[PDB]
C-alpha cells in the first residue's frame, strides 16, 4: 500500500532474518574462544532478541571480534527497524488527523 507502511513491514521481515542469521553467525564466531558463552543456537537467538531491542541484560554477550561485529549489525538493524515503525506511525497520524481539520 503506502510507502512508509511497506518500508515498516519490510523492516520487520528483514529484522527476523538478521535475528536468525545473527544466531548462526554469532555461534560460528564465538565457538573457538575460551570462556565464550554465546555458543549454542537456542540461547544465541535469545541473545539476538535482547540485543536488537537493546535491553541487553548482559547474561550473554560476544567476546570475539567477529561476534562483536555481528552484534553491531543486529543492534543497528533492530534500532533502524523499530525506528522505521515510529516514523510510519507518525506519517499515519499526521496525514490522517490533517483531514480532521
Amino acid at each position: 500500500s503506502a510507502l512508509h507502511w511497506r518500508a515498516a513491514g519490510a523492516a520487520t521481515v528483514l529484522l527476523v532474518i538478521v535475528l536468525l542469521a545473527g544466531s548462526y553467525l554469532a555461534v560460528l564466531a564465538e565457538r573457538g574462544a575460551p570462556g565464550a558463552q554465546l555458543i549454542t543456537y537456542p540461547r544465541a537467538l535469545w541473545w539476538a532478541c535482547e540485543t536488537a531491542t537493546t535491553v541487553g541484560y548482559x547474561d550473554l554477550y560476544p567476546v570475539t571480534l567477529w561476534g562483536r561485529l555481528v552484534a553491531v549489525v543486529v543492534m543497528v538493524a533492530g534500532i533502524t527497524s523499530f525506528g522505521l515503525v515510529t516514523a510510519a506511525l507518525a506519517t499515519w497520524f499526521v496525514g490522517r488527523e490533517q483531514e480532521r481539520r
Partner: antibody
Framework: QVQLQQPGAELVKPGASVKLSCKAS????????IHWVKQRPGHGLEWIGE????????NYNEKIQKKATLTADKSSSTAFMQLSSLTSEDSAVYYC???????????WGAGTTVTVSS | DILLTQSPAILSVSPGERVSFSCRAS??????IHWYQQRTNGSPRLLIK???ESISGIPSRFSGSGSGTDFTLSINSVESEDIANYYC?????????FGSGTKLEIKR
C-alpha cells in the same frame, strides 16, 4: 539406521599419518557440528575438536598438541580427521558424534580403533 | 576451561538400591550439564540432557538434578544392565569438557 559410520580400525607406523572418516545419515541441518572424542584404553573421554560442515569451520582443543585437522565434504556427507606424525601416545579409540548445535552429543559413532606400531 | 570433577570414581551398591553419582563444576554453569553412559566395549549413550531433561528411550529409573556447580545423576533401584561408566559433560562455555568418569559396581 546407524547415524554415523566409521571404519572399525586403522594401523599407522610411528611418524606416519592416517585420515579417519565418519559418514552421516538421518536428518542433516545447517546447525550440525561433528565432534571427535579420543579415548585411551582404561581412560576417559577427551574432546579433540569440532567442525561445522555447512560452513567448513573447525575448532580444536588448546590443552593438547594438535595432531588433528578437520575437513568436511558436503556432497558425500562425510567428515574427516587427518591425524599426522603419530606415536604410541596417539593410539586409542576415536569417536565422532553429532551435535545439533544445542550442546549435547545425541548420537555417537562405533569408534575407530587406531594403533601406532611398526 | 571448566573442570568437571566426578567423585567417587567407583560406586558400589546393592541390587535394587538407589545410587547417586556427583559432578562438581569449577564454576557456575547453570544446568548446562549432560550425562553419558558407556558400557564395556561400547560407545557413549546420552542419558540426561540439561541436568534434568529425560531422553527418549531411557528407563524411567534414570534421573538428574542440580544447578550451578553441583549436579547429580541418580538411579532409583539399580540393576545389572546399569554396570558401566558414567560421564558428565558441560556446554556452558567453550570448549566443551568431560568429567573424569565414574564406574558403577554391583554387590551381588
Amino acid at each position: 539406521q546407524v547415524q554415523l559410520q566409521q571404519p572399525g580400525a586403522e594401523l599407522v607406523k610411528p611418524g606416519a599419518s592416517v585420515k579417519l572418516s565418519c559418514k552421516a545419515s538421518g536428518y542433516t541441518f545447517t546447525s550440525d557440528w561433528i565432534h571427535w572424542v579420543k579415548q585411551r584404553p582404561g581412560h576417559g573421554l577427551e574432546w579433540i575438536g569440532e567442525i561445522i560442515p555447512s560452513y567448513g569451520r573447525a575448532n580444536y582443543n588448546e590443552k593438547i598438541q594438535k595432531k588433528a585437522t578437520l575437513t568436511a565434504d558436503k556432497s558425500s556427507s562425510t567428515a574427516f580427521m587427518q591425524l599426522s606424525s603419530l606415536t604410541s601416545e596417539d593410539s586409542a579409540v576415536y569417536y565422532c558424534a553429532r551435535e545439533r548445535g544445542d550442546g549435547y552429543f545425541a548420537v555417537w559413532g562405533a569408534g575407530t580403533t587406531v594403533t601406532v606400531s611398526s | 576451561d571448566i573442570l568437571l570433577t566426578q567423585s567417587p570414581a567407583i560406586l558400589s551398591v546393592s541390587p535394587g538400591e538407589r545410587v547417586s553419582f556427583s559432578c562438581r563444576a569449577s564454576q557456575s554453569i547453570g544446568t548446562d550439564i549432560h550425562w553419558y553412559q558407556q558400557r564395556t566395549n561400547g560407545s557413549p549413550r546420552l542419558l540426561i540432557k540439561y541436568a534434568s531433561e529425560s531422553i527418549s528411550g531411557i528407563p524411567s529409573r534414570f534421573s538428574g538434578s542440580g544447578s550451578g556447580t553441583d549436579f547429580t545423576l541418580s538411579i532409583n533401584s539399580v540393576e545389572s544392565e546399569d554396570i558401566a561408566n558414567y560421564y558428565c559433560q558441560q556446554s556452558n562455555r567453550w570448549p566443551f569438557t568431560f568429567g573424569s568418569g565414574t564406574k558403577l559396581e554391583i554387590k551381588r
